[PDB]
Amino acid sequence: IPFFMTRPQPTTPVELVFDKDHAAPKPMNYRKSDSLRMSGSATFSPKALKEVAKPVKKNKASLYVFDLRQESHGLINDIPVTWYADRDWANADLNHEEAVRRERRLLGDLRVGDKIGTTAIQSIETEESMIRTGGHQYVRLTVTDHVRPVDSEVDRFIESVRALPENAWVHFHCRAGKGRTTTFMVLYDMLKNAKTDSFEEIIKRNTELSNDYDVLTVPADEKDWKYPYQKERAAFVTEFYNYAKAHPNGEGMLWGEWVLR
Ligand SMILES: [Mg+2]
Ligand SMILES: [Mg+2]
């Protein structure tokens, strides 16, 4: 597999968007695997954190929330917000550190007292703050919606997985809870189970669990803008299976090293 270099141009205008459906006390597109001790959802509110934490609840520290979002986001008046541009490609030119810095900068540019339409800002919070206040752990990856992760972010993921305590529970989310979230549930499952389970079985159980049946499907139309991105994602997950089979739980070699053999 090649070293992965292609990417989209970032989109504009970027606008702060209040994600009102994500403000509900239950997380959207939620699903879980008790055997893998993993779950996935859309980005969620302060009140929904207790729901996400249920499978762990008497062991708060063992929940690790993996935020997969490249685009910037946070909480204003407990409402999840996104700095949105088309396809959530606002930050598509930024590497991980740049994307993390950009989100800090945009949240810092908000002020208590600002009026954005009918909203008067009274509370500004990072998502990490909200997660950690609940006694849980937080890991940020930066993945572009519709695009596979870059190799170094896959390594970042693996390094985080290798450092997990026994009996960690991992919860993935992205803005919609489909696409990126499903892919990393697949990658996590392969890290643990590629050594014993088939590629097709792993894809099958995760598409079914996530009601995300076209996560890896390549459009029939080659002029559909998603076509090259889906081809890339498919190649990536197909080779990741081979890596994870050879290096269960990332033992002995990271993905990045594997690619550059
Ligand atoms: Mg709050
Ligand atoms: Mg640059």
Numbering used by the authors: 33 to 293
Structure paper excerpt:
The B. bacteriovorus open reading frame Bd1204 is predicted to encode a PTP of unknown function. Bd1204 is both structurally and mechanistically related to the PTP-like phytase (PTPLP) class of enzymes and possesses a number of unique properties not observed in any other PTPLPs characterized to date. Bd1204 does not display catalytic activity against some common protein tyrosine phosphatase substrates but is highly specific for hydrolysis of phosphomonoester bonds of inositol hexakisphosphate. Phytases are a group of enzymes that catalyze the release of orthophosphate from Inositol hexakisphosphate (InsP6).
Bd1204 crystallizes with two copies of the protein in the asymmetric unit. The peptide chain conformations are extremely similar with an RMSD for Cα atoms of 0.31 Å. Bd1204 adopts a canonical PTPLP fold with a central 5 stranded mixed β-sheet of topology β2/β3/β10/β4/β9. The central sheet is flanked by 2 α-helices on one side and a 5 helix bundle on the opposite side. Importantly, the β-hairpin at the top of the phytase domain between β7 and β8 has a large deletion in Bd1204 that results in the partial β-barrel that is present in both PhyAmm and PhyAsr adopting a much more open conformation. Additionally, a Ω-loop between β2 and β3 that is present in both PhyAsr and PhyAmm is absent in Bd1204. The deletion of this loop results in a significantly shallower active site in Bd1204 relative to PhyAsr, (depth of 7.7 Å versus 14.9 Å, respectively). A comparison of the electrostatic surface potential of Bd1204 with PhyAsr reveals a significantly less electropositive active site in Bd1204. Examination of the catalytic motifs reveals that the general acid loop (D177H178) and the P-loop (HC206RAGKGRT) adopt the same conformation in Bd1204 as that observed in PhyAsr and PhyAmm, indicative of a conserved catalytic mechanism. A notable difference within the catalytic site of Bd1204 is a peptide bond flip between K210 and G211 that results in the carbonyl oxygen pointing towards the catalytic cysteine.
